[PDB]
Amino acid sequence: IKQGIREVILCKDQDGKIGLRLKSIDNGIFVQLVQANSPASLVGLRFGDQVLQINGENCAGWSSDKAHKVLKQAFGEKITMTIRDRPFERTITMHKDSTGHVGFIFKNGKITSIVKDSSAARNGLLTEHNICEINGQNVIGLKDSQIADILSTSGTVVTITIMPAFIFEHIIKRMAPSIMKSLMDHTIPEV
């Protein structure tokens, strides 16, 4: 998680899209959805990113509808954006035991127990937190089984990005479970 504020420059694609859904939380605007292969994905916008500004206008206090309106009505040629990196999220690093476990249970991507003397316990992993990313890959909307499978196919070192459950439930309100599984960018970062 980068500790402050960066500028990003988007271009609407050929259908006039940037591949973003924004959401109002606590008088800020946050990324609720990034579409795969979107101008939003190419410049590296992530679920939980805070949009401080669009084209130099402060987003403070905007409704989600006004944020989408401002975007729709923008000279697609070139949109600038000031971004704070997933301010609600934290990153935890764990190591698999010889049995290949980091040491937690989860249901709907929300961690509900920490196993005793697990890596999860040693690095202070918490319950009532949703898994957003594993090793930089967004897993939101994937089946539990499929998240389980990604933790298998990661190495012995597993970095998880997490978010308090209440904050996660507030961000994803009014988006069908089909959109998150099917249209949320789940790609491995690109170099």
Binding site, by residue number, is: 108, 143-144
Helices within the chain (DSSP H only)? 39-42, 64-72, 119-122, 144-153, 165-172, 177-183
Q: Is the dihedral of CA 172, 138, 93, 44 positive or negative?
A: negative
CA distance 72 to 12: 10
AA identity, residue 59: C
CA distance 91 to 93: 7
* Torsion angle in degrees (nearest 10) through CA of 137, 140, 144, 149: -10
Name the DSSP letter for residue 138.
E
Asked whether 151 and 143 are in contact (CB, 8 A), the reply is: no
- Calculate ∠ Cα 140-2-33, nearest 5°: 30
AA identity, residue 63: S
